[PDB]
């Protein structure tokens, strides 16, 4: 029953075309609930959930102020890291930031995150002890020194450890009927012939929440994990997810392969077979 | 809520 509230920030520099583009997204569990785009004319933290619109105008006044201050901060780190790597000032560069907390089913703190990234690769991160950083390269050692001399990991401690836990346990009761639901998968199986002597078996899983599911193709006990397409858990778009696993079993050998589904919304794993 | 206005800058 562990729950998490994560915030994803994507600051992309566009030299010669205006200010860097900034996008901020927040997710309780896998349900987005806020949004911020530096191009949208609103220039405000826009709700994206029905259970988050019950927050007074002061919530959206503080939230907008605290996300634009991160937008302007990332607007000066892009120029700072550009010189740190000594790159040309006419190229596009991306700074990504993620943080949040993990709150158990008890409603208590489990783990706090803070992870930055420059150009897709890891840049710096916050260790599980919440007081030490893990620089990823030789340019991030300067940041790790600026963030230790100014106690960046100690001021941030009262947010991941205290503020995220208190504010995430506000969403899990406001969004009680949405975030705290487990919809079981609507599993089914299909046979698509490709040849007279070869065929494929597709094991489906539609409309399950949360997105964490496992589809496996065991052939008489042994789980294959070989020649088994396992496309990523894809969102249906209505707050649920979809996923399917395939296999290239030969014709006439259909009735020896089984599909097992282990979703937390299911009483026990399923044992889908053909027919 | 997003992190406040405390920090330094990379």
């Amino acid at each position, epitope marked *: 029953g562990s729950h998490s509230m994560r915030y994803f920030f994507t600051s992309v520099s566009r030299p010669g075309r205006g200010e860097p583009r900034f996008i901020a997204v927040g997710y309780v569990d896998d349900t987005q609930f806020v949004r911020f785009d530096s191009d949208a004319a609103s220039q405000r933290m826009e709700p994206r959930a029905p259970w988050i619109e019950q927050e007074g105008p002061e919530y959206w006044d503080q939230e907008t102020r605290n996300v634009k201050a991160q937008s302007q901060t990332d607007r000066v780190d892009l120029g700072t890291l550009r010189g740190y790597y000594n790159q040309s000032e006419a190229g596009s560069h991306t700074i990504q930031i993620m943080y949040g907390c993990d709150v158990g089913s008890d409603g*208590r*703190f489990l783990r706090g995150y803070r992870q930055d990234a420059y150009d897709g690769k890891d840049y710096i991160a916050l260790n599980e002890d919440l007081r030490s950083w893990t620089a990823a390269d030789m340019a991030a050692q300067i940041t790790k020194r600026k963030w230790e001399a100014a*106690h960046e990991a*100690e*001021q941030l*401690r*009262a947010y991941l*450890d*205290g*503020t995220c*836990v*208190e*504010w995430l346990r*506000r969403y899990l009761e406001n969004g009680k009927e949405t975030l705290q639901r487990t919809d079981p998968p609507k599993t089914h199986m299909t046979h698509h012939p490709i040849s007279d002597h070869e065929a494929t078996l597709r094991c489906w899983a539609l409309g399950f929440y949360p997105a964490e599911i496992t589809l496996t193709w065991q052939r008489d006990g042994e789980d294959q994990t070989q020649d088994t397409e396992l496309v990523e858990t894809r969102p249906a778009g209505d707050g649920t997810f979809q996923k399917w696993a395939a296999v290239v079993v030969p014709s006439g050998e259909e009735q020896r392969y089984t599909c097992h589904v282990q979703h937390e919304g299911l009483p026990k794993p399923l044992t889908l077979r053909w027919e | 809520v997003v992190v*406040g*206005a*405390c920090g330094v800058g990379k």
Partner: antibody
Amino acid sequence: EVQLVESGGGLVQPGGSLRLSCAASGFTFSDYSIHWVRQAPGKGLEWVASISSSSGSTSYADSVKGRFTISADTSKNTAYLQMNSLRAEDTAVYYCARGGWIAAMDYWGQGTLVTVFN
Amino acid sequence: QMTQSPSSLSASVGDRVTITCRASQSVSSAVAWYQQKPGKAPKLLIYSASSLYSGVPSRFSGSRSGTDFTLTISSLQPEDFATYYCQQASYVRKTITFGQGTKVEI
């Protein structure tokens, strides 16, 4: 090393005005909160109001919610507490504290008696 | 709401005393313990409900059994007779709440 010195409280009539000043010294004032806590005579501690020197966030105790206003001058290391519409129950010893990054007021002042007298 | 129990407890030197604090809707992060000797500014002892503040003697220690926070003095000394307050902060409401206070006597 950190010293919090509070001053400016004394005898005042109900429905009057006071401005309690907490002169912090010993730390970067912009990085720590400054809380005002009052100790009613004989009774226990009661948190009154709060300020965040950077980002300018305030808070009040719902018993001094509309009456008190905290300000803070960053280049004076001095946080103020303006007390309006002072009631007979507002008399106490007012300590100014320091939110110390740990969700705890690690450094406290000394106290400033405020006597609302009719 | 939050009730600190008991409002007074008397024990001799060397005993083990436990002051409980019922922080129903509080995070473990924001629960701290203070010690106010009469007519003096309080003194932080525990923060985050278990972590000793630097300089505090190691006989103080906190814990949490469910929605209930405890301060334990392992071996009482003739300097630990004061009034003890537990705080709780609600980041949602932006309020620090101080417990009633437990007066440890002789």
